[PDB]
Design an enzyme around this catalytic site. Sequence first.
Site, mmCIF file in Angstrom:
data_model
loop_
_atom_site.group_PDB
_atom_site.id
_atom_site.type_symbol
_atom_site.label_atom_id
_atom_site.label_comp_id
_atom_site.label_asym_id
_atom_site.label_seq_id
_atom_site.Cartn_x
_atom_site.Cartn_y
_atom_site.Cartn_z
ATOM 1 C CB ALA A 152 0.703 2.633 5.665
ATOM 2 C CB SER B 178 0.364 -1.799 5.723
ATOM 3 O OG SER B 178 1.403 -1.839 6.682
ATOM 4 C CG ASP B 179 5.330 1.900 2.822
ATOM 5 O OD1 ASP B 179 6.293 1.491 3.499
ATOM 6 O OD2 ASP B 179 5.433 2.723 1.851
ATOM 7 C CD1 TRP B 180 7.270 2.253 9.646
ATOM 8 C CD2 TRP B 180 8.713 0.627 9.079
ATOM 9 N NE1 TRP B 180 8.001 1.926 10.761
ATOM 10 C CE2 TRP B 180 8.908 0.953 10.436
ATOM 11 C CE3 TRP B 180 9.549 -0.328 8.488
ATOM 12 C CZ2 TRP B 180 9.867 0.324 11.223
ATOM 13 C CZ3 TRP B 180 10.496 -0.956 9.266
ATOM 14 C CH2 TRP B 180 10.641 -0.630 10.633
ATOM 15 C CB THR C 41 -0.928 0.009 1.272
ATOM 16 O OG1 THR C 41 -0.185 0.214 2.494
ATOM 17 C CG2 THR C 41 -1.751 -1.324 1.413
#
Lengths: 716, 715
Positions: free
Chosen positions: A265, A261-263, A228
Amino acid sequence: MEQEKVQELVSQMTLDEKIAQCLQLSPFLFKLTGPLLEMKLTDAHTENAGSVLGSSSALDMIGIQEAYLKTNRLGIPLVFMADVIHGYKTVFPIPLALGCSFDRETVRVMAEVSALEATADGHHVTFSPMLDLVRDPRWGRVMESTGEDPFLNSELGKAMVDGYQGDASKLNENLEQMAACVKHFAAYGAAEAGLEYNTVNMSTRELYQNYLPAYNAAIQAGAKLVMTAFNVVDGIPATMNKWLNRDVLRGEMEFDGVLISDWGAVAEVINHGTARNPKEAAQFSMEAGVDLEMMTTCYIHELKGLIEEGKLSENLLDEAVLRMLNLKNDLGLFEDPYRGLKNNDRTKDILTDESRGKARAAGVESAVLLENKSRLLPLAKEAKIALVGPLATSPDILGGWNVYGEEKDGINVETGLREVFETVEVVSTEYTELSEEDKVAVKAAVQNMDVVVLALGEKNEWGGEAGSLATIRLPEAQYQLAKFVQTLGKPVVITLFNGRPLEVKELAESSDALLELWFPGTEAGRVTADLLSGASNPSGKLSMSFPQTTGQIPVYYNHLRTGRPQTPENKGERYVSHYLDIPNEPFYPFGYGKSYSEFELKTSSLPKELNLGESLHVEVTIKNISDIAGKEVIQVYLQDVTASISRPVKELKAFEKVALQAGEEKTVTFELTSEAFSFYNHQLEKVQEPGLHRVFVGTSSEDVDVFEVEVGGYVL
Amino acid sequence: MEQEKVQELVSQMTLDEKIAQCLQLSPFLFLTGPLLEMKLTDAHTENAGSVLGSSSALDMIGIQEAYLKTNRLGIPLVFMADVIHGYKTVFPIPLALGCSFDRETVRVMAEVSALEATADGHHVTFSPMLDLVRDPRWGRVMESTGEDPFLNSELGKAMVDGYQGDASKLNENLEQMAACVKHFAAYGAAEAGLEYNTVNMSTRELYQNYLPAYNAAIQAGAKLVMTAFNVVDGIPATMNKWLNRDVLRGEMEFDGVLISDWGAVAEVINHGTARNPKEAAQFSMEAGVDLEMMTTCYIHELKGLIEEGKLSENLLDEAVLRMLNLKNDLGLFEDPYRGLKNNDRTKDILTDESRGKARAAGVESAVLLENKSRLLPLAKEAKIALVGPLATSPDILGGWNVYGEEKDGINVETGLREVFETVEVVSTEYTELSEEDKVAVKAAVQNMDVVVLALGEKNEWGGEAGSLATIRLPEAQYQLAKFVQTLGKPVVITLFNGRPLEVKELAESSDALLELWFPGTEAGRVTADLLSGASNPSGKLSMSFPQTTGQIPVYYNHLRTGRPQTPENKGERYVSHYLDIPNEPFYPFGYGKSYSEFELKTSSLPKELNLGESLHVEVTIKNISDIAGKEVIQVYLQDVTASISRPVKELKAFEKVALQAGEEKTVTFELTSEAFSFYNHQLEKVQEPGLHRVFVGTSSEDVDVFEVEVGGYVL
Ligand SMILES: OC[C@H]1CNC[C@@H](O)[C@@H]1O
Ligand SMILES: OC[C@H]1CNC[C@@H](O)[C@@H]1O
Ligand SMILES: [Mg+2]
Ligand SMILES: [Mg+2]
């Protein structure tokens, strides 16, 4: 193992286990690439954690996975993910430089070497390719994209997936290949004013038209994961955007893998103002179909309550868990959790000489020769070189997004150059200063030698994530140095190292030659020495437009006509689309680059007419008419002259880099399918309209021949 | 005349007369854009619907007279004009008027503008310009009231009301005129600030921020609307059926004349959404454009379209009826000369009353940005070195000044010598700083006690097709400000310009900085009264002033993002920031100084509110200094959690309060539930339960904050 046995594992896990299966942690939380959270983690969480990101070696992996499997109730191994962006230990050019190769095979080989090496060190997944369309070089992350064209980006994205993954359906068997994760879904590169993580907004039609196709191409080529994006998309953080991730990603793109998810997110949708608290974040992210929360805890502390309270169906949780185990199975981790390592040390596969030769070849495919006045270049091997500037000796040539490569193994410009040229005098300067002492030492070196190699550039920490620059210029002291060197009256080559387009007008005008090497990676200094001495002949073309000035941004070759275009027949008229102070043209356009060779191209007879649904076949004969061997990038563009939507003046639809010996002639053929002629309409349908199109064949977006084809009649 | 007789006129018109009624031409055919071969016949010019750009009473009378002698049915021409910030008496440019935050100042500008223009025979003005602006590269920022939809809405209504008064009595009130809202829609979002360039944003964002000022002007009774030059979601506005039929005519219930911008009907060709003039015509008429400005697609193609059955003639009759209904609204069928014919009104043009009104707008609109150590106001005996390119330049009327004349304006030198007894002038050029300038500047500064450094843009550097990629004065002006600073005497910079500029270097090189924009006719008196303290600066920024060109777009109503920079994560790596500048603009929306000092406090607000309920905000303000002045109290709302990421603040009320020294006042604001509402994912206008923060203060940054939990039932 059998799909029935995987499905049975979901039946057997407790709620708390299924929940923690949807969490990814850094290695230091098992017995950073993002900010750190008080996560209130317990053993129950770590011992059932789904994934590890950022392991530092094979040993790290084996240690962690062994400990974890001692103590895991059902025998579900951890999946290990890593940032392998443009190489692992052998570092290749940054992806924006690879964009400029216009060479699909160079890109596939980069990815294959990357995988060879990363799998050797325990890594199962890479967080690559980055398929974000970029039009704004303020944003530090342009170095990770292959640039401003959807088509090129799509094509190179597929090349990276094929290189990392090979045949996706045999990743349980081919253990030097690894899983690719497409990032960042979606449209992250359009961050407003190039500021990191800032607002993105465009119409849904534009999103489909230019922003989604590359992710889609990589998905359709079989990318195993999708990550994401940090940004809103039409006002909703992508991570909890149901429409984007369920309707588009999972529905229209038929993506059925793990959505990570990105970090942070998932938690960040709070900051964004679209969730009041971690309970709301969790619910909304799981409803949107995020399967794996990266390094935040919204899921572990809140899913149970959401399911027990009936605000979330547990079926959503079971499908996430199933996608997580299916991945692990696709990588064959249920039969071998160490994925080829346990008995077979593969350190021998890392940083081989063959791999170095491939990175070097990638370098010389990717550099872009921008100016070369008077055949200054290539230099004779006996040329006496004054090598001056902040990039003379700086070992900072590996580039941004280099988590694993080491500078001590890299080749600086001075070392590269002394391997090839007998006489070199060096004067290193600092990145942001130009002292009187420097000027005295520079003046002496230049007085002694016959030609100047002026090595200028960015530190890599001026781009990448959270490396936004409002003014896209080198430090002023470097422009001052190029102005000083110019007063000394010797021919000057500028070799520029950087990770984004820059204002280079003053450099071009202060030098005789200008070569854009970007960050070539491990072999930088040899890439540089081969191109300068002509052992290699420059063959890169710009994949991103180089603006006249910061204030011209965004500028890009696939732009709309407007209602008052500047024509050469209205030059100097007031009422036309122009600036008072600069030209409309970027300083250097997409698809532009020079060569030590000279080419002529000839396009075969095309039809005046074409049916709808029909392919246009473009035949092009190219000859090298010089005495120097070399490569040219043939580019084919299409324009749709009248449409129900104002269409771009051009769009790249095919390219091929053709190698030609001196005197040698080749013929290449391109099929433009009817999809090349199609576009998204007002109502968001992918359509083909009867009407006039123009086809452009040449060696840049500006150096082309033009042809007219009228599409109508019946449909094939 | 009666509605039946209008309707009857349509019934009596031939097809060619109906077609030509939808044509507008410049006077010379019986310039504010490029001209075509139009292949116009007498039959064309004798049945034309409208004239734009008449240059006097006599020109108009001449044209109407000739025209009415040959028109078969006695249908007079309607005359339109660009009266943007004044006719002959020139008021501040609209961006400066934005900074006034003063609704009444804007209504008066418009009223005086109508008074004068109706005197010269003009029936319509192509004002107000209601394009939201976030990009100061674009030259046309001078014509907007700035980056806020609410302020633009509010000031937009004020202008409609000033030009029009009671819209139902425009046949009776002959000193008022019809307003034409422009440019529909979103023209100000031009990519990279490049004139006529691509516009793209989500429909939600179009609704949320780009549409509301046009809408407020429409609802307040604006008689016309003009189309815009840009695409909207990929389709030129002029032939954008959705935009003009569904939104403009349908949702906004607009039922007047939709006029094209200049050649915009023909230019859909260039845009690539029509093959040729027949296609252009067909698509523009479908979209509901009633009046083609100075191109000929309709004239040469409507006939064939209609006869061939590609267009229904009913769409044409509908367009013609709207044209006649405007003329009838303006009373032209009883008086085609709209009060002129026997009553000569030259007396009403450029009066001293009008001049005092423009001077007053001037002093309301200037923004005091810096004033270190009470440099200002200056003592009337202060000895002034007045230097720079705006010391004597008569270029102070602003862009979009079609009718005003520089000979009637007051330059800074003239203004200043009326107030101050000792002034030494050294004029410099706009783009040069010579060694000789510097010797002459050095001597005048040495003689006097304080420097008035008068810097600025020529007006031809903005307005239409005045795009600058770098938003800076000529480098020679920044050099001049640097040189003056070395001479050791206090410096006031008086800056004249039509756009935000990089002024960090000017603020750092001076003790005071005053932003006059282009005040118009009275510029030099405006400047002189503010500097001597006869007027006290009271303007605030209606547009943010970026740190550097590369910060653009930067605006106060921005989204939080997922990683906002907080005081408690400073210089951490993973936060939205630039490596080389701050996130904040150099000066923010709603910022400006005063020679007074004010204290505010907000009475107790409820902690909870029902959905659909208004929040009533009471604010007590005191002037705690010895100096009479005005403060602009501003109220912002934020919606902390929503189904769409909402801005950190949005202006929802403001009032400019005048206070004698010591005086205290109470002002109340109503924030209706509509101020709490927004456009959702499905484009519905909605109100969600939840927390909102309310901010009361004197800029977007200088505020107190209060929380209200909205929920419960609906009113
Ligand atoms: O390290 C994992 C991720 C962190 N945030 C930005 C991503 O590109 C990266 O892969
Ligand atoms: O002169 C009439 C019109 C010309 N084009 C731009 C508009 O703002 C103007 O009113
Ligand atoms: Mg077409
Ligand atoms: Mg809310």
